[PDB]
Amino acid sequence: GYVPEDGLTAQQLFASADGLTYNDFLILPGFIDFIADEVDLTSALTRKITLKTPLISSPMDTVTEADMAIAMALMGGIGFI
Amino acid sequence: GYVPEDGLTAQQLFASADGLTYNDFLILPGFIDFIADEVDLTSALTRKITLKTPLISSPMDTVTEADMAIAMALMGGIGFIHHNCTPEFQANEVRKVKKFEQGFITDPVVLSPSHTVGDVLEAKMRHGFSGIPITETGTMGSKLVGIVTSRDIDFDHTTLLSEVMTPRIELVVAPAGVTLKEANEILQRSKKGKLPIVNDCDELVAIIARTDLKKNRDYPLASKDSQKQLLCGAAVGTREDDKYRLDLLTQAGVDVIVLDSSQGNSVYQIAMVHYIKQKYPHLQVIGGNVVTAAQAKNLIDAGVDGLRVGMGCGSICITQEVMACGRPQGTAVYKVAEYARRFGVPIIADGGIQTVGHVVKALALGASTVMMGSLLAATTEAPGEYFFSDGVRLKKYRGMGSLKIAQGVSGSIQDKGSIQKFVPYLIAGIQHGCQDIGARSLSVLRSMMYSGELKFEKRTMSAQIEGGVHGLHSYTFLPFT
Ligand SMILES: NC(=O)c1ccc[n+]([C@@H]2O[C@H](COP(=O)([O-])OP(=O)(O)OC[C@H]3O[C@@H](n4cnc5c(N)ncnc54)[C@H](O)[C@@H]3O)[C@@H](O)[C@H]2O)c1
Ligand SMILES: Nc1nc2c(ncn2[C@@H]2O[C@H](COP(=O)(O)OP(=O)(O)OP(=O)(O)O)[C@@H](O)[C@H]2O)c(=O)[nH]1
Ligand SMILES: Nc1nc2c(ncn2[C@@H]2O[C@H](COP(=O)(O)OP(=O)(O)OP(=O)(O)O)[C@@H](O)[C@H]2O)c(=O)[nH]1
Ligand SMILES: Nc1ncnc2c1ncn2[C@@H]1O[C@H](COP(=O)(O)OP(=O)(O)OP(=O)(O)O)[C@@H](O)[C@H]1O
Ligand SMILES: O=c1[nH]cnc2c1ncn2[C@@H]1O[C@H](COP(=O)(O)O)[C@@H](O)[C@H]1O
């Protein structure tokens, strides 16, 4: 009835100061009891503004003229000029 | 008289959570007092099934049509049939894998003596089974009339079949209700190749054929169940419509199923194990890919008879880099095989295996068997075609997640020739490395694992750049493939 805890918790990784990046670690799998597209994504951008999706286009000249702002705001995100 | 212990024991490696893989460590050598090919390789697949060799072929579409299942079950291993095709096709595949060698042949093709001999040729092309018993009504519940054979078909073909078949008076036969060891001797001492079996009423009940005895000398390590026929496995998915697929596979006589999924722990999968083990009590079941003991509890509690471990480690996958979710293969196999050992289920390692050394490392860590993908692609009996590229004979290697999102790639592997020579090279390079380790059997090897007698060391990246090194101008390997 007992199963050993495996894997470093969130805080135990970034205690030893090796300066990890997204490439350096994995997230262990859990239990599944819902359909893959049931899950919610609503996320705050700033205190008063919320977006239906966590994606933002970067304000670089080579990424965001108005046509991207439109096409990304139309799908949850936000666009910075 | 004292010699210091050198090297980390089994448990001391995976305590410091660096997430080691098969490349990150070595196994220190022991003492040798046996010949390189003396050792046993007998290994459990599931609670009730044992194999004379730890090799398993992957259930990918690009690896396991029936011809590989045959050619690897014939050499100790077992073969799982890919599931991404219509249930009727998959049932035919597992049926013609079961029927390649036989004890008492119980549904032979039989013809009535009024058939045209050109219909024997049609049936021979339809099945491949070239010698055929003849009975009156033309089914399995009639009196013997004779046998027609390929040695009765060399001479258009419009003749009635009674003219050419051998008469029952001259045909030697054995009485029914005889065990498969007296009928075998009665064939051997009455040296004609297709001995039938008839009851006292002189009606057909079974037949046996000399080539099945010949195959038992030629392939002595083959894995055959009680009825003396090859063992076969099906992958099946977890979806509602695979509940229909299950019955077609079970009517075809499959003996193991693997509940194929990316992440084994789901409520859909745990409910599927219950449905299988309640409806079909005989079938052994293997659980979907697990990487941590905290999810191997739900699978064993469900009732699964074995587990396959590892997710997102593999040649063909891109699943870590899409899902963010996974675990390094070397840590996973040990950290779940130690736990699953208590309840007495076999872990089977799965993919990320690309050399014989990785096979030995995966067996000396807890895995009862190792499941091969890329290392069996482009062998002769892997399905498909040899599309010559820029100076290379190579064959397809498609990941199932490679065409809602795509979580595997689609690529190619260079030709490796017949699996019939490749599997003995793996066997002879496994036991020859188990000799250097110092273990007389794989059971002894995992006892050494769990007793602390085996000792590992970590290998820096600077020490992975070793063997076949950058100091050569150019080189050629030359294994026996
Ligand atoms: N890359 C890998 O990790 C890997 C390994 C082996 C096989 N596969 C193959 O790729 C696919 C991976 O997806 P999967 O393993 O989740 O199986 P799947 O393809 O059947 O599942 C598809 C999706 O629907 C869900 N699903 C599964 N069974 C369900 C059910 N009964 N009812 C409702 N939803 C269900 C899953 O959560 C998943 O999001 C499989 O079809 C398998 O053939 C992938
Ligand atoms: N495909 C198929 N094979 C069967 C069937 N029943 C038995 N066999 C097997 O087919 C194999 C070949 O049978 P044989 O009768 O020896 O074939 P053969 O052509 O007469 O003899 P060979 O030329 O030596 O192959 C044996 O292993 C049989 O057990 C069947 O219905 N279909
Ligand atoms: N007809 C037939 N006989 C076989 C086949 N395989 C093995 N036999 C023989 O049938 C008999 C079966 O007895 P078993 O006690 O099951 O044989 P075994 O000792 O397990 O020997 P193996 O099956 O060879 O490992 C033996 O004489 C075997 O050699 C087969 O596919 N067909
Ligand atoms: N038990 C038997 N008793 C008598 N005749 C048989 C018996 N079994 C087969 N025959 C007949 O004897 C001849 C050869 O039988 P055999 O068993 O050697 O055929 P086969 O092994 O299939 O021949 P081949 O391998 O050359 O194609 C054929 O005419 C065949 O019909
Ligand atoms: O993306 C993938 N899709 C399907 N199966 C995969 C994938 N990646 C690896 N595998 C699994 O791992 C094995 C393939 O071994 P590999 O060739 O070493 O990667 C198979 O037996 C599968 O269970």
Swiss-Prot record, chain B:
Activity regulation: the record says: Mycophenolic acid (MPA) is a non-competitive inhibitor that prevents formation of the closed enzyme conformation by binding to the same site as the amobile flap. In contrast, mizoribine monophosphate (MZP) is a competitive inhibitor that induces the closed conformation. MPA is a potent inhibitor of mammalian IMPDHs but a poor inhibitor of the bacterial enzymes. MZP is a more potent inhibitor of bacterial IMPDH. Subject to product inhibition by XMP and NADH. Also inhibited by ADP.
GO terms, biological process: 'de novo' XMP biosynthetic process; GMP biosynthetic process; GTP biosynthetic process; lymphocyte proliferation
Q: Which residues bind K(+)?
A: 312, 314, 317, 466-468
Binding residues for NAD(+): 260-262, 310-312
- Record keyword RNA-binding present: yes
Q: Name positions with the PTM Phosphoserine.
A: 150
Catalytic activity annotated for this protein?
IMP + NAD(+) + H2O = XMP + NADH + H(+)
Provide the positions where the record notes the PTM Omega-N-methylarginine: 327, 341
| Listed EC numbers | 1.1.1.205
What superkingdom does the record give?
Eukaryota
Where does the record place the CBS domain? 104-159, 165-223
- Its principal location? cytoplasm
Query: Do you know which Pfam families this protein is assigned to?
Result: CBS (PF00571), IMPDH (PF00478)
Q: List the disulfide bonds.
A: none
Give binding positions for IMP: 315, 350-352, 373-374, 397-401, 407
What quaternary structure, including any partners, is listed in this protein's UniProt entry? Homotetramer.
Name the associated disease, please: Retinitis pigmentosa 10: A retinal dystrophy belonging to the group of pigmentary retinopathies. Retinitis pigmentosa is characterized by retinal pigment deposits visible on fundus examination and primary loss of rod photoreceptor cells followed by secondary loss of cone photoreceptors. Patients typically have night vision blindness and loss of midperipheral visual field. As their condition progresses, they lose their far peripheral visual field and eventually central vision as well.
What name does this protein carry?
Inosine-5'-monophosphate dehydrogenase 1
* Protein species of origin: Homo sapiens
Q: Which gene encodes it?
A: IMPDH1
